[PDB]
Amino acid sequence: FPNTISIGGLFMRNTVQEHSAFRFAVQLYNTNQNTTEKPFHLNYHVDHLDSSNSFSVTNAFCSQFSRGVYAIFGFYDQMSMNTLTSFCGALHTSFVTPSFPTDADVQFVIQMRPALKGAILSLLSYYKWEKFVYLYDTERGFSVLQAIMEAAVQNNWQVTARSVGNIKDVQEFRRIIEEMDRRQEKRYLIDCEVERINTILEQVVILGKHSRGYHYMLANLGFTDILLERVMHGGANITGFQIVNNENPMVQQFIQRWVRLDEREFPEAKNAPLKYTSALTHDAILVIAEAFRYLRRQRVDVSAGDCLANPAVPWSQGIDIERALKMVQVQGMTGNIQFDTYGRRTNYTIDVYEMKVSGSRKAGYWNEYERFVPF
Amino acid sequence: FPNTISIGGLFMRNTVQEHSAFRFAVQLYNTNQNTTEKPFHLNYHVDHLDSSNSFSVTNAFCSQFSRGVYAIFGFYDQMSMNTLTSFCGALHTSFVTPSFPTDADVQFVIQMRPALKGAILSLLSYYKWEKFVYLYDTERGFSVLQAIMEAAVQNNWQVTARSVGNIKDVQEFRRIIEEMDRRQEKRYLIDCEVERINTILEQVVILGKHSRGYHYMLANLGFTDILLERVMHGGANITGFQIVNNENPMVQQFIQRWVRLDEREFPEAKNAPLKYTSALTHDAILVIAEAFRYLRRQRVDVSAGDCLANPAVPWSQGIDIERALKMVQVQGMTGNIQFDTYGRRTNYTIDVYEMSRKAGYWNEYERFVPFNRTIVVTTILESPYVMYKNERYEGYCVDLAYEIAKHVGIKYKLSIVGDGKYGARDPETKIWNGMVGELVYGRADIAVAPLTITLVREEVIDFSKPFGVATPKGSALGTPVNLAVLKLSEQ
Ligand SMILES: *[C@@H]1O[C@H](CO)[C@@H](O)[C@H](O)[C@H]1NC(C)=O
């Protein structure tokens, strides 16, 4: 086993807090004084992507690959998903990511962002949403959209689906909302980005659609990031989902030790709310450390060239590392962390917040086996 | 100047006829004996790549780059567009493509497909389309969609835009068409792929919307690949766009030589109609030949390593090759061929077909040179209001509907609700049932029936004065029906 484990980091734009969480988690692992908890020193090579120039993304990935790396933690969007996923799958290099899970079942990628599809379907069945308006964009994949369509077909729902990803003018949102209200539509499932959700909520506030007779289900982890101050005052239902628990002791101690770091080495940390992606980054560091500790425990022999070496020969140990990254069962800031054969999270819990009352109240939780437990 | 010029080629799925056209055009260039338009041999490398796997695309591009090429002809999809465009613009290697033009301004990309936004806007202005349904797909870019949106905002149009690129169930197409027909939409602008256009058109044929009075504008240069026999047999108007004119002598010569090619060596020839992408491939070969002939005539110096070598070394001769390729002006099978600073085609002509006959032609400078309702009445089977005997029913409400229609002057058709209920909102699902549900959800236009004027219903539909007669809220029949009810109450 190597005396030092080096990993890579691929950070796209607007990931300052995620970068700070990555550095802080690596430092937390490194400063542990227990030889059993720290059998190897962990280093990282951090590079920043463009995500619009595939040449730049490939250059950064190949610079990471040329130097010795055992795993790559990073982020991708819809424009850089395919390049990184394909390169990692072909070169047998594990890619640990907090980004949206891939629609296709692909290997050598560990996406520890739980899928909202099951929770969304369970809440739709529980609330009995047999007719609603589904406003979606395709910036996080098509899994939720396909699941909604299949559920509507099998359950004979009345789902009015609208793709709002390509809308640049707010009057289009106003027209959509007015048309929906003309048809007496009271229930909206908004599977969009945080900024698009904010724009839609501004439009519904402007049109006065935030009254007590409307329900908005925001299908987006990061409930604390959406601006809901002005929609609460109208009395409308707002269902949200989260994976970070504030009263979790591990989350509590991380926050306690995390809000007292100077904003010169860890920017966007102290005077800023903790995004769920930072918790996923901390959990990713935990998963990597646990997997490599297990590899050392079993005495598995793990120890580059260039990306494009046609005929490409993958390095043999990589598969083992993938297995080590997929058999872990760890407890992190998002709760239980386990992965299936495709790298997707399994046996996870998603907290559901109703927050219709003044403030935020956690209406219940969702689990794969016991579907939805309300309070 | 080298005795031979080597070019790369990147082909994908459903690109057999285009590959045959590429090979045949290269053979035609190499088989000339004048020695003036053929001063050098033309060698080609060909790679078939899977666009869904970026690793394979990068492998193919880098293999061709390392082999040594002066330009890459080929196709890109919405997934492989970014990779190929970035790799060509960063390594200063020209990419000649007959695929969709890039929305953004990029360098070292020579796009052989002319843009359709100008022709579509001019045809919309000519036909006076103040209100239409735009079904878009966004598999050839977003330029047309944003152009339509800006034109609608500036000209105060009523465009009902729907994205049909994520639809896999034909019932969704049926529901969209039914919803558009309910709101009295006659004109459709379908900017989608050929297969999606065919699916939409067959759904239209099944729904019987292909009759007279309906206009369908197909925003795709694939008019010959669209199955629309039944659509035009119904009497509807179909406006199409083309770039290949069969009356062009060069096109005729190419076709007469093309239909006599051995299918073993040249698959998809003399078996299927010549796709416009094959014509663009032939014209791209002509463009490459003319540009390199210009380079040789001007005595411009012309000459590798791996793609990914930090810091990247741009090709010194790439700028000259791109400049020569972007100043070419040739008469190809698609007409005049010229390129602007960003590689997009300029000064082109688009033939507009009204159907088939050539309605006219669109050019950038000379813009475009050319050459009642059956209202649904919903009722409920309840004596003596509606009783089985439009001729199948009699009762008070049938006579009331007849009188109201005579005062309004409309043609109607009675239809009793399936569930046989009045309006009621389920507290759990918030769904209205009965006649009020039909009116709210747009499946009916008026409800002459014993429907009590209540507060809960009044908030969702318009009630005339008691006789009340219900109407969907905000419709154009509210005041006429209210006045008719009042006048009938007068007598
Ligand atoms: C809002 O929530 C309340 C309490 O859960 C529920 O009774 C009401 O029907 C909801 N409104 C909707 C779903 O429009």
Swiss-Prot record, chain A:
Task: State the disulfide connectivity.
Answer: 62-307
Carbohydrate attachment sites?
Answer: 34, 237, 347
Which superkingdom heads the taxonomic lineage of this protein's source?
Answer: Eukaryota
Q: Where in the cell is it found?
A: Cell membrane; Postsynaptic cell membrane; Postsynaptic density membrane
Topological region Extracellular: 1-375
Report quaternary structure and partners: Homotetramer or heterotetramer of pore-forming glutamate receptor subunits. Tetramers may be formed by the dimerization of dimers. Interacts with PICK1, GRIP1 and GRIP2. Found in a complex with GRIA1, GRIA2, GRIA4, CNIH2, CNIH3, CACNG2, CACNG3, CACNG4, CACNG5, CACNG7 and CACNG8. Interacts with CACNG5. Found in a complex with GRIA1, GRIA2, GRIA4, DLG4, CACNG8 and CNIH2.
Further information: The postsynaptic actions of Glu are mediated by a variety of receptors that are named according to their selective agonists. This receptor binds AMPA (quisqualate) > glutamate > kainate.
As for what it does, the entry says:
Ionotropic glutamate receptor that functions as a ligand-gated cation channel, gated by L-glutamate and glutamatergic agonists such as alpha-amino-3-hydroxy-5-methyl-4-isoxazolepropionic acid (AMPA), quisqualic acid, and kainic acid. L-glutamate acts as an excitatory neurotransmitter at many synapses in the central nervous system and plays an important role in fast excitatory synaptic transmission by inducing long-term potentiation.
Report the sequence similarity comment from the record: Belongs to the glutamate-gated ion channel (TC 1.A.10.1) family. GRIA3 subfamily.
Please state what the protein is called: Glutamate receptor 3
Q: What is the lineage of its organism?
A: Eukaryota, Metazoa, Chordata, Craniata, Vertebrata
Shown portion of the complete protein runs from 24 to 402 of 888
UniProtKB/Swiss-Prot annotation, chain B:
Q: Which chemical reaction does it catalyze?
A: Ca(2+)(in) = Ca(2+)(out)
| Residues involved in L-glutamate binding | 450, 452, 457
Q: Glycosylated residues: list them.
A: 34, 237, 347, 372
Q: Which GO terms describe its cellular component?
A: AMPA glutamate receptor complex; asymmetric synapse; dendrite; dendritic shaft; dendritic spine; glutamatergic synapse; ionotropic glutamate receptor complex; membrane
Q: Would I find Signal among this entry's keywords?
A: yes
Its membrane topology, per UniProt?
Answer: Multi-pass membrane protein
Q: Name one GO molecular function term.
A: ligand-gated monoatomic ion channel activity involved in regulation of presynaptic membrane potential
**InterPro entries in the record, alphabetically?**
ANF_lig-bd_rcpt, Glu/Gly-bd, Iono_Glu_rcpt_met, Ionotropic_Glu_rcpt, Iontro_rcpt_C, Peripla_BP_I
Q: What is its main location?
A: membrane
Oligomeric state and partners? Homotetramer or heterotetramer of pore-forming glutamate receptor subunits. Tetramers may be formed by the dimerization of dimers. Interacts with PICK1, GRIP1 and GRIP2. Found in a complex with GRIA1, GRIA2, GRIA4, CNIH2, CNIH3, CACNG2, CACNG3, CACNG4, CACNG5, CACNG7 and CACNG8. Interacts with CACNG5. Found in a complex with GRIA1, GRIA2, GRIA4, DLG4, CACNG8 and CNIH2.
Q: Miscellaneous notes for this chain?
A: The postsynaptic actions of Glu are mediated by a variety of receptors that are named according to their selective agonists. This receptor binds AMPA (quisqualate) > glutamate > kainate.
Family membership: Belongs to the glutamate-gated ion channel (TC 1.A.10.1) family. GRIA3 subfamily.
Name of the protein: Glutamate receptor 3
Specify the species: Rattus norvegicus
> Lineage in the entry?
Eukaryota, Metazoa, Chordata, Craniata, Vertebrata
